[PDB]
Design a protein around this ligand. Sequence first.
Ligand code: NA
Ligand code: NA
Lengths: 113, 118
Amino acid sequence: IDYKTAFHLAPIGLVLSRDRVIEDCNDELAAIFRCARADLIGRSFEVLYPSSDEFERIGERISPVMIAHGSYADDRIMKRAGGELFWCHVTGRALDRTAPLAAGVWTFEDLSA
Amino acid sequence: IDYKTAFHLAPIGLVLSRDRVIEDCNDELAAIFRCARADLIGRSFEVLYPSSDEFERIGERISPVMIAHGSYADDRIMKRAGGELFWCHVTGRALDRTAPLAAGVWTFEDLSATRRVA
Ligand code: NA
Ligand code: NA
């Protein structure tokens, strides 16, 4: 199993992000959000939140923690395509902690499942 | 970020496994188990369980669930280098569900830290 196959086979949603936009993701991510990978490539994380306000609020919660610690994890309500709300465990590591919401690796796991 | 860097910088422990042996892993995995990556490469998952019996018991629990569903997730107690026992959330996907404990991708996350609710 090479790194590409690992990324795509992974049992959790994985994202390579830059500036809160999904640059690459796996099928597990697509599945959690009830869409296709193609729906998510080049898409702002905003669309996965219950609202734009939530996307803003949680971004402001992420930044200081990521800067201070170099990693981030939380649980939050997120929104599937079609509107269904669900609890989701999310973890993140920024490429540079002082640029917390820039390039990074992000994980998503459905907690209702 | 290429796929190699994603693997190595991931915020959770990642493992590329074959027959319950760790073929590759990231630094987060090493950190969780309080050792070096070099300590884990070519290492049986067995050493990370509280005991051989646990390794065997959990293997038997993984198998039918992985075979039936093509994925696996649980929480269990694992063992750090030095013997400290801790709770760990683990997920796995086998390359072939009918060979559930052969080649696969596995994740590990330490549940010791208080969960942040955003
Ligand atoms: Na980002
Ligand atoms: Na294996």
